[PDB]
Design a binder for this molecule. Structure first.
Ligand SMILES: *[C@@H]1O[C@H](CO)[C@@H](O[C@@H]2O[C@H](CO)[C@@H](O)[C@H](O)[C@H]2NC(C)=O)[C@H](O)[C@H]1NC(C)=O
Ligand SMILES: *[C@@H]1O[C@H](CO)[C@@H](O)[C@H](O)[C@H]1NC(C)=O
Lengths: 665, 665, 665
């Protein structure tokens, strides 16, 4: 009667009833945490402003007179230029107002200040004539220009002799004008600047504006009237005019005020769904529409400290009105006056709170509390400042996304934390009637190690089991009683030994390999007896209360009490760099890098022309030498006579030679 | 016999058997939701194009003649310049083709149009001589230049008298040329522009191209041949040549066609793993390689409407061929003709679908369905357009990431939602045999409040329990029967009262503080009786069926049926701004801000030179006064004689004085 | 006695006891996975450097002499300029060192090289006089300038005759100077360049630096001394000076060494909380402070290969010292020497590891292992290189965020995976005593289909049930026995039929619609008998062991064993594009696009002036014709006499006429 387990994988445990010595208890439903109240989002409309870098850009009209006078020396079949003087000349005030404005013409004469002198240039070197302004030729992507002279003047051919030819052209050319903050100078598309502020005048203290030019160069015309140079129909509108002359030209333009025309800020974006939140001592402005969150201090930014920010109010007012009348007008209602929070990163924010008609009951609170939010801090003390604005926007996209992801994931994580907690709490009843049914199993699964257990009233008493090797356990074949039939064992018989040499000890195989000491599990004998029992890592099958054979585990088809669960972590992912256009594509997109251009235009020498070489040439170095010295004495004499006083005594002499000789004849 | 609970923390409940009045039932497995089919990703290869800002850049050759003529007036030991005329002159067509091209030389004479005149300048004021072109000096980061004259001319020294010195230099200089869309003008690295289109000619209707210049200035050479200026070996290739002259210079270049040379778009990126998805009426192109998703309308963009986008087809074809032959060629197969979807944000997309040999069975469908996707919308109506391309790329990284995060998190969230649902469904069996075992506990945990319960067939009947204070409950000491020994109580005896003054009412302490009314839980008396019982917030221990003492809870070692769960939400995180380089670092990286440069070069006056001061000086202001008036009359007379007709009568007079005097002698 | 189910929704199953044929088993606790060790983050301090685009910017002083000489021709009431020569002249070395430096004055004479000639210009055409340098007028946002002449010279009025007027102005103007890598040329704010390296000299082999200029133009002053031009107090410091002259001007500056002055890199950011991680064969540098992660190869970048990166060491050293003394000095301690990892994307990284005093035990290891990390790869072979740095930073923000999100979400996902696994394992005990209580239910829920079950020892035997339609099942009214009272059925009686025509078969309704064949569930008769039973999709209520009536399900109030679970997936979200400022706002912010400016300044012709028109004019074309031909012969003769040799014979003749006539008188 010698039988051992097929698989010694799982050791047998002999586990006796315990004493009241050791005794343990279960936990109880730890009061589970609760949800958060959630961040209160105040709906509103936003409009965000940015530092202006786009220069102030306007229109003006230029008036000038190109004065080009040339030497020409002649040969037998040929004429060469000996020098071309080429100048830009201002047109006087009166000649613009009278000859150019009213009559659309211009003097053929120039009279202007250059190089500490007055000059007067005759066109053709001929008598002054009022000449006509005719439209400039067809020109592409340019302004509309005008001129009098379409071709310059040059003297008639006198064989081998120097002539001078004067030419004057009265040109009018309307142009654009650009200006950068603080707007004290302005440029012309001709590359010429004007060193005067574009808003100077006589009206509302306009003498305050800085101009280096003396007051007389520029005059302002109150209630001025303009007439087109081609159409020549007077403009219906009366425009206050301004006219400033330079040593090269004279420009005129229409005058407008300052603050309702320029602004350090500029309107950047319009958000109809901007959500304000208050957290950790700051506001976050989440446009769900454009995926954006903004960080602002609690107090509104004081607009007064905004410099020249009169664009702000007007712009924000118009935009917000249009949006609210469009899409919010019958669903919510306005709450308080608009707010100008300062957006971390240099983005000026206009934000309008608003509440639904659904819960207008609350408006009193909200209104008061919105009014609390602008400080009157500038009032008790004027020093002004600009707003420094960045050029990248990514903190807001990333910050929004991380808060929306963060919102969802932490939200769900919380919900499932609660659900798990209350599930484990809910189980203890199942574990409680279950622990009542079979104490040994539940106590072993609970404490962690295999132990005995018995109910000691409303508590559980335990004591550690005893390990027993499989090669030291015997199965006896029979399950019936030879002495008393009709009442036979319900579970097989085992003869284990606690030590490989230890005495053989009989017992009754119990559930889950517990080699119970007492042989007391008897049932009445019954027909059709098929029983699979637990033994070692496998099973042991008896038919009709008698040892059939031992089986491995997978011999029997297998089902499960388990609900599958399949999680895959998010694999890593590298983020490669990327620029849309590189900065060298931009320095290259600049059709001319002025730097490169001048760098070339100034090597116009050392490449193919030497400046480190000096030449002295003498015609007389090039009895006969003595005679040549004689003409030099004459040559040096003529030098004394090349100039005024020596020259005067000679003209007086020349008068004599011809005079005296003839009167005698 | 007066005993009360150690801890009154938990009130006792007396809970009687119920009536059939109140009766409740359990829920049943709510059919759990199911997974989504998942978005079908169509593998393919992509190539994305962008607006061209890099100007069209090519090579050309300049030819000109610097004409510099100078006055020099002399003193005793010294010579001063009185004026330096300095001009740039064009080289005629023939002198380039004949003297410069074939012979590599150039005339020492200039003959060119300037200021409505023809001029002819002699080098040295000496007879025309064909002169040699020698290489320019060593120059760094420049082109390769050439010249004839390496040093200018100046007259010999004549004491106190004005001389003129002419100099002509024939210079050749090959340069780069840049051009911006629409490419009607092009620049030179010398800063000089040429107001003609770079593709003008006589071939395939090239008279269409706009040029303001008259046809005669520029000539095209069919089948032209070039020879190096230093190497002077003829180029093997025959190049159609173009030659345009300006009033300052003359440039020549090789001619090429238009559309196979320029393109409003430019190839930006090559993606071998671009995944197309269709969702919500749009396509999303997720390059897993570069972390990108693209949004496109359903229909392909019509390439024909792309302006000058003949670069597109060629480029995309070559690239996609190279990739597919490289890495996809034996695993997938091509599906349909390539596609040009328009990428929201202005990114033109070339996308090639493709399917695996694994499932080529489907190709018919896919092919047809891919062919359905380009519309023939331009055919029934030519108006063209450019593609406006942005300069930031972040919508795609953020949109990809949010879709991949979103994919993973919502995927796992769904899986666990299902698993929980079917777990709660799976539990009801446990709760069902468990609810059978001890109705009171399961009904109390279920309904939420402590109630009684008994099985009413296949359902459960309930009735609310009764609260009972602890200071109103007594434990009687004994647990055995004085009258009938051998059969003694299994649970202690209590004498509670429902009201602090209410009558004392006897009962038998039950499980979990239920003060059962009927005293009927009896077991046979047994040795070794140790029992911990539940009483109040604590326990009450009896030995041998007799009151020992009451204990607190933590007196007993504690185990648990709970599986720990530890979740931490994702802490907030602020995102600080950051620019790599600021825009002022770029306006500063521009080695010259042309704006700043001219702004300085035009204050070259008011800082250290006054223009508002005019000087009139008279030599005669500087009996003797009467004699001085006499020379003025002579001075003004000489003025009449300074000019032609007065001067003629004088030369005729001068002829007489010397003539008449001598013939008589 | 004819009764059928109210709702045929749920089919009845007749399910008999099984045979030992079919038999199944449960799963066992699959050993659950375990947590990861987590990535070891090495704390440290970082400083990251970037390619320098900000040019090297310094100060210098310019010295020059504007030489302006003018023709003026006069009329009766008027004077016109005939040509204004205007030049920039260098001031010689000695005149700067002696006249300008020591004495703060300057010569009124210019003597300089231009156009291969020496020239000497007299101011006023008057004797040389040392003149004073007086401060320039008030000028805004300019440097401080100086000059001698504040107003130019012009000749006195001689009626109808050409005069020349010379003017020289000695101007000093200190300016800024800019320079781009490789720093061989440098610009001036005047737009003029200087084609020499800014670090050339005589000290420590400074003859190596490239200059095209000959050595004589520029001289270096060892131990130079400067004195302010207004304050005129000598500077205390002795500065080595450098003086280079150009053909137009002469500039001077103080000399400094090279490598401790310029650097291809530049300090970009300072991170006190930079966390290094090692993973997948690379390092990731996560500044938690600025939301950043960096990717680097294992080996440090060899600084020696950094070109001119002597700024690097000094800068990183100072910064890291300041931070560590500030905030880390008593909590951690330094580990090893600093490290220069090369940041993927072109960002040079200085990184200092450090460990806490908490666990300094480990330092030996860490130190050694940190020292292992810089390679000595450059030593066995000098070739140098720059570092190419990008202009966008987003890979780091997105990569950091995706790793922090990824960290949290995968972390929690893992924890809950484990918890679920061990929960399902923990349940099997509940399912095991529960499976013991009622085999049919647990086997049916387990296998998936309704089956029979009975305990076959330590295993379970099953056999499939039989479906039975509801319209084929009868409820008999009574529940008591007519023959034997006092002992009556516990569950109602049914007469089903397996086929719509099949014979009627009696049985006893069991739990959950099992139509048990054997009628053997009897209890003793009892008062107050109310029983709800399960029947069809509904219930069937008997009072006092007799058919009352059948009810629907919702007739009874309903409770639940289920813990609610509410998950919402993250809704999709589109990310719209966005630029802060567009590139056209930048080309527009450039107050002058030099490209646009010159493009306008070169159409100063074709719009309003025709160059394609040539004029030939003849005064003589404008008996009398014969007499006019006579003056032309004289006119052409005077041409022969307009020049030297013909002119000499005439002056000799003129000498005779007056001479001979008078001596005879
Ligand atoms: C539950 O998990 C959290 C997060 O891992 C543990 O909190 C950390 O505990 C130690 C000591 O405080 C440190 O790793 C961190 O400082 C803690 N994280 C914090 C404060 O965010 C926590 O100990 C865990 N609880 C357990 C396992 O019972
Ligand atoms: C949000 O408002 C509600 C009541 O309006 C209240 O829970 C609390 O004041 C706010 N919750 C926060 C700030 O978490």
């Amino acid at each position: 009667r010698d039988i051992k387990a097929e698989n010694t994988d799982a050791n047998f445990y002999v586990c006796p009833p315990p004493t009241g010595a050791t005794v343990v208890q279960f936990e109880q439903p730890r009061r589970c945490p609760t949800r958060p109240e959630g961040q209160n989002y105040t709906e509103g409309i936003a409009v965000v402003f940015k530092e202006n870098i786009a220069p102030y850009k306007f229109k003006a009209t230029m008036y000038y007179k190109d004065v080009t006078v040339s030497q020409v020396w002649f040969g037998h079949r040929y004429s060469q230029f000996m020098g071309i003087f080429e100048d830009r000349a201002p047109v006087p005030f009166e000649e613009v107002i009278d000859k150019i404005n009213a009559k659309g013409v211009c003097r053929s004469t120039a009279k202007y200040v250059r190089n500490n002198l007055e000059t007067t240039a005759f066109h053709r070197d001929d008598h002054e004539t009022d000449m006509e302004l005719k439209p400039a030729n067809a020109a592409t992507r340019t302004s509309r220009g005008w001129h009098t002279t379409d071709l310059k003047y040059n003297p008639s051919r006198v064989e081998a002799f120097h002539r001078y030819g004067t030419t004057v052209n009265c040109i009018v050319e309307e142009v654009d004008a650009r200006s950068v903050y603080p707007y004290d100078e302005f440029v012309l598309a001709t590359g010429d600047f004007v060193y005067m502020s574009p808003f100077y005048g006589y009206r509302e203290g306009s003498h305050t504006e800085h101009t280096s030019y003396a007051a007389d160069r520029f005059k302002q015309v109150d209630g001025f009237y303009a007439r087109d140079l081609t159409t020549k129909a007077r403009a219906t509108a009366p425009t206050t005019r301004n006219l400033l002359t330079t040593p090269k030209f004279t420009v005129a333009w229409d005058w407008v005020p300052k603050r309702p025309s320029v602004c350090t800020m500029t309107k950047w974006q319009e958000v109809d769904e901007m959500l304000r939140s208050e957290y950790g001592g700051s506001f976050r402005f989440s446009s769900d529409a454009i995926s954006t969150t903004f960080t602002t201090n609690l107090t509104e930014y004081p607009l007064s400290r905004v410099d020249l920010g009169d664009c702000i109010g007007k712009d924000a007012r118009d935009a917000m009105d249009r949006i609210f009348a469009r899409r919010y007008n019958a669903t919510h209602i306005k709450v308080g006056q608009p707010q100008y929070y300062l957006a971390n990163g240099g983005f000026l924010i206009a934000y309008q709170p608003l509440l639904s008609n659904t819960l207008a009951e609350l408006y009193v609170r909200e209104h008061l509390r919105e009014q609390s939010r602008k400080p009157p801090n500038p009032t008790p003390p004027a020093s002004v400042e600009r707003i420094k604005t960045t050029s990248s926007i990514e903190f807001a996209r990333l910050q929004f996304t991380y808060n929306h992801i963060q919102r969802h994931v932490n939200d769900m994580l919380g919900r499932v934390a609660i659900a798990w907690c209350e599930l484990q709490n809910h189980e203890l009843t199942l574990w409680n009637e279950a622990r009542k049914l079979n104490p040994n199993a539940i106590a072993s699964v609970t404490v962690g190690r295999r132990v005995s257990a018995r109910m000691l009233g409303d508590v559980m008493a335990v004591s550690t089991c005893v390990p027993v090797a499989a090669d030291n356990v015997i199965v006896q074949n029979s399950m019936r009683i030879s002495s008393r039939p009709g009442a036979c064992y319900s579970r097989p018989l085992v003869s284990f030994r606690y030590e490989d040499q230890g005495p053989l000890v009989e017992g009754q195989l119990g559930e889950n390999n517990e080699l119970r000491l007492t042989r007391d599990a008897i049932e009445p004998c019954t027909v059709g007896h098929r029983r699979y029992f637990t033994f070692g890592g496998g099973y042991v099958y008896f038919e009709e209360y008698a040892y059939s054979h031992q089986l491995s585990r997978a011999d029997i088809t297998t089902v499960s009490t388990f609900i599958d669960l399949n999680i895959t972590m998010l694999e890593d992912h590298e983020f490669v760099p990327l620029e849309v256009y590189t900065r060298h594509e931009i320095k290259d997109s600049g059709l001319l890098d002025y730097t490169e251009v001048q760098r070339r235009n100034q090597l116009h020498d050392l490449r193919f022309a030497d400046i480190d070489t000096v030449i002295h040439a003498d015609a007389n170095a090039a009895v006969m030498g003595i005679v040549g010295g004689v003409v030099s004495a004459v040559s040096g004499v003529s030098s004394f006579m090349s100039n005024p006083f020596g020259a005067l005594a000679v003209g007086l002499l020349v008068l004599a030679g011809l005079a005296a000789a003839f009167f005698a004849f």
